[PDB]
Write an enzyme that holds these catalytic residues in place. Structure first.
Site, PDB file in Angstrom:
ATOM      1  N   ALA A 257     -69.774 -97.521  22.210  1.00 41.83           N
ATOM      2  CA  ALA A 257     -68.854 -98.656  22.439  1.00 41.83           C
ATOM      3  C   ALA A 257     -69.068 -99.713  21.355  1.00 41.83           C
ATOM      4  O   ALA A 257     -69.064 -99.396  20.170  1.00 41.83           O
ATOM      5  CB  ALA A 257     -69.074 -99.185  23.841  1.00 41.83           C
ATOM      6  N   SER A 258     -69.281-100.960  21.783  1.00 45.92           N
ATOM      7  CA  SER A 258     -69.442-102.135  20.938  1.00 45.92           C
ATOM      8  C   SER A 258     -70.365-101.996  19.731  1.00 45.92           C
ATOM      9  O   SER A 258     -70.002-102.304  18.597  1.00 45.92           O
ATOM     10  N   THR A 259     -71.473-101.276  19.980  1.00 46.89           N
ATOM     11  CA  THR A 259     -72.634-101.224  19.108  1.00 46.89           C
ATOM     12  C   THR A 259     -72.305-100.546  17.774  1.00 46.89           C
ATOM     13  O   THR A 259     -73.093-100.743  16.839  1.00 46.89           O
ATOM     14  CB  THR A 259     -73.799-100.513  19.809  1.00 46.89           C
ATOM     15  OG1 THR A 259     -73.424 -99.173  20.123  1.00 46.89           O
ATOM     16  CG2 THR A 259     -74.228-101.208  21.081  1.00 46.89           C
TER      17      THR A 259
END
Length: 526
Positions: A257-259
């Protein structure tokens, strides 16, 4: 005769020299039931001498039927030297009953190091045939236990040593001793903070690749598997809905996801799909050109004007939807492979999944279908068919920190070979892009923003910080949403990188809160 001598197993220590896997001597009372008469009377007689219980006789009576008849059966396990001595003086009274001494592995921190240390287990009928094929059953002629998990399994060849022989002497060579990179204190601390949470945490030294802590919650008692694990209790773990047998650090497969945004940033820069200057306006959505399909941002009304740096700080989705479209899956995929996504990290543990970094070729092989443009877009925010392990998420951050100089995450610090310590030597010498591209620093700067700048998504967790932390949060879905964060500190000269994920939100405390506590604990000396 020419019978064999068991070599003593190598010891395992942390950075400090604290023992984590010891060799203890265990005494038990045995008898061949054929050479005993009035067995029931003899058992009754032993109650006061060795504190023999009804549970001891139950396990005995039952284990004698399962066991081949006319063979020495454990009467009482274990015995304290007190109980051993109390018997020794009454040896004369009980002929055909004796005290046998065995070398057993002992894990004095148990649950704390289950997944990393692992365990040795009783060699069963399957393991004997395994060892025959390889052609080193001779070396295990006297050995009752073998490594089946973690370091115990991975480093068996090193830990076991050379078996001895005696004509009735050729002495056995002890197994070589293992010093790990792991910090026992930190491991316990993290586990304290993670109590209740189903989670994974990798803490690493980005300079070495050495793992300071590797934690999968919930754990189990490694001891049970040493004493030939009870089928009843085994199925107790296999049915636990919190699946504690899984090493979430290395086998836990999660949408990153975001990472991933920092690694996509560097990749887009390096391919010239964007520059430091490249700017774009986010209304809070992004349209696949020509279609009416709208991909939303986390901010409903958008982040407005965005470059890489703002888009990382605020974790803007619209920016990265665009980047993903322009990059296209072929070279977006190829770039994320260079960071190790889809690939085995090279960690010195046998328990590991590789997750998925999606590909055209993969979707044709797997689903017998072509790659649609709509499949490329979610990959942009690490939510496509994209799945990753915490150890992979940990390794990619270390590569970013080291400007494409890839470091193999690893637990082996050094081995005592003939009294001398020979240290771990990294085989991998891979370089991603150019070392001085400056693109790495643009990405790292963006992560500095997430932590410290007033528009950063996790500024709330890194207030009052003597050091400057760089961080990057993520939120993944499947029951609740998983919470991710990777972070590293001192920003100037990073000495510690973290990867942490709390399954389905965890047990209350925010991942950002726990990352702060961990970074404080290490750098402030608690």
């Amino acid at each position: 005769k020419l019978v064999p001598i068991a070599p003593s197993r190598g010891m395992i220590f942390d950075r400090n020299g604290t023992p984590l896997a010891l060799n203890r001597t265990i005494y038990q009372l045995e008898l061949m039931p054929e050479k005993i008469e009035n067995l029931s009377a003899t058992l009754n007689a032993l109650r006061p001498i060795v504190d023999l219980t009804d549970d001891d006789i139950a396990n005995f009576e039952k284990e004698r039927k399962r066991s081949r008849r006319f063979t020495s059966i454990a009467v009482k396990t274990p015995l304290t030297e007190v109980q051993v001595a109390r018997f020794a003086v009454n040896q004369f009274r009980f002929p055909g009953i004796e005290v046998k001494g065995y070398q057993r592995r002992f894990y004095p921190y148990g649950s704390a190091l289950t997944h990393v240390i692992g365990y040795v287990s009783k060699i069963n009928d399957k393991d004997v045939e395994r060892l025959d094929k390889e052609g080193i059953l001779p070396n295990y002629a006297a050995t009752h236990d073998i490594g089946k998990l973690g370091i115990e399994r991975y480093y068996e060849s090193t830990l076991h040593g050379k078996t001895g022989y005696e004509e009735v002497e050729q002495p056995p060579q002890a197994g070589k001793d293992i010093y790990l990179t792991l910090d026992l204190s930190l491991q316990i601390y993290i586990e304290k903070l993670l109590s209740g949470s189903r989670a994974a945490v990798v803490v690493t030294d980005p300079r070495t690749g050495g793992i300071l802590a590797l934690v999968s919650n919930p754990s189990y008692d490694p001891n049970l598997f040493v004493d030939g694990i009870s089928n009843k209790d085994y199925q107790g773990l296999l049915n636990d809905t919190n699946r504690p047998l899984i090493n979430r650090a290395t086998q836990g497969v999660y949408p990153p996801a975001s990472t991933v945004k920092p690694y996509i940033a560097v990749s887009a820069l390096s391919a010239g799909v964007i520059t430091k200057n490249t700017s774009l306006f986010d209304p809070g959505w992004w349209q696949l050109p020509g279609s009416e399909k709208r991909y939303r941002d986390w901010k409903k009304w958008g982040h407005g004007r965005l470059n890489v740096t703002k888009a990382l700080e605020e974790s803007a989705d619209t920016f990265f939807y665009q980047v993903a479209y322009d990059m296209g899956i072929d070279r977006l995929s190829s770039w994320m492979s260079k960071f190790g996504y889809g690939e085995y990290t090279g960690i010195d543990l046998s328990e590991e999944r590789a997750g998925l970094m999606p590909t055209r070729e993969w979707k044709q092989k797997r689903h017998k279908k072509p790659w649609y443009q709509g499949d490329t877009i979610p990959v942009g925010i690490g939510q496509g068919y994209w799945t990753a392990t915490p150890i992979q998420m940990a390794k990619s951050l270390m590569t970013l920190i080291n400007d494409g100089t890839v470091k193999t995450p690893h637990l082996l610090q050094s081995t005592r070979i003939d009294g001398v310590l020979v240290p771990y030597k990294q085989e991998d010498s891979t370089q991603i892009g150019s070392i001085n591209s400056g693109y790495w620093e643009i990405a790292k700067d963006g992560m500095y923003g997430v932590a410290n700048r007033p528009n950063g998504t996790g500024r709330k967790f890194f207030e009052g910080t003597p050091y400057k932390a760089a961080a990057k949060s993520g939120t993944a879905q499947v029951l609740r949403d998983h919470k991710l964060m990777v972070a590293f500190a001192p920003y100037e000269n990073p000495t510690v990188s973290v990867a942490i994920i709390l399954e389905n939100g965890g047990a209350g405390p925010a991942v950002g809160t726990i990352t702060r506590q961990i970074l404080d604990h290490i750098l402030l000396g608690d």
